[PDB]
Design a protein around this ligand. Structure first.
Ligand code: SAH
Length: 234
């Protein structure tokens, strides 16, 4: 109704950046205290690796391409350092927060020695456009809540342009347990329901080819879901 203010109306990019710029540039920092002294990094990587294994038959490169990925909302590069580098031929990263970018050069040093890091785009995803046709995989994890719904639809539409033939978008994010989105004043982001995600994916012209629950996380955390998305055919 005219009286309701949507959860995503409260998002302010500047407030998110102010929060994250003061977060420690460590696994503990980006995971909000659920670092290597907890099960979370290990479970997260296992779940993502299992998801990509399930998806292997859906991700064969076409038209002479190689497995160029991008790590969206990358933080200090944890997902690339501990997971994506095994799957990908080359990795770009998108991250707006400068202390995180600076630490990424340390975290990713061994990958840089191989030339496996292409470009680090120091930008919010809302202002980023992939090069057309570049990516085999666009991996978005624990970051799309920083964009309101309309902006997230727009971002996903730009992602489609950035996909190789048979490229894939993965979104690995929290879900609220009910059909009402939650705004977090801490990081100026929304947590969405599964139903909201499915609406957004449809509006963006994406088909859901897999939806899997991340297992093994502490019960006090929101559920986490992995979504694999392909553009709808013309
Ligand atoms: N508008 C935006 N666009 C892209 N990333 C954003 C963003 N606003 C915040 N972020 C980033 O989202 C990240 C959330 S923490 C998760 C980091 C990483 N995906 C991992 O799983 O380890 C932070 O690095 C934060 O700076």
């Amino acid at each position: 109704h005219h009286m309701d203010v949507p959860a995503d109306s409260h998002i302010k990019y500047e407030d998110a950046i102010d929060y994250w710029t003061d977060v420690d540039a460590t696994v503990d920092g980006v995971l909000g205290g659920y670092g290597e002294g907890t099960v979370v990094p290990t479970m997260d990587v296992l779940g993502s690796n299992n998801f990509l294994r399930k998806l292997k038959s859906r991700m064969l490169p076409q038209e002479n391409n190689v497995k160029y990925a991008v790590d969206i909302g990358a933080g200090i590069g944890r997902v690339s350092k501990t997971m994506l580098h095994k799957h990908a031929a080359k990795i770009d990263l998108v991250e707006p927060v400068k202390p995180f970018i600076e630490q990424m050069h340390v975290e990713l040093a061994e990958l840089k020695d191989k030339g496996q890091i292409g470009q680090i785009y120091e930008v919010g995803m809302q202002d980023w456009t992939p090069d057309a046709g570049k990516y085999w995989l666009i991996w978005c994890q624990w970051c799309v809540g920083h964009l309101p719904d309309a902006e997230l639809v727009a971002f996903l539409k730009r992602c489609i342009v950035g996909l190789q033939p048979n490229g894939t978008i993965v979104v690995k994010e929290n879900n609220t347990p009910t059909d009402t989105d939650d705004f977090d004043e801490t990081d100026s982001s929304v947590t969405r329901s599964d139903a909201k995600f499915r609406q957004i994916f449809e509006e963006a012209g994406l088909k859901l080819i897999a939806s899997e629950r991340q297992r093994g996380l502490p019960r006090e955390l929101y559920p986490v879901r992995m979504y694999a998305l392909k553009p709808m055919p013309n």
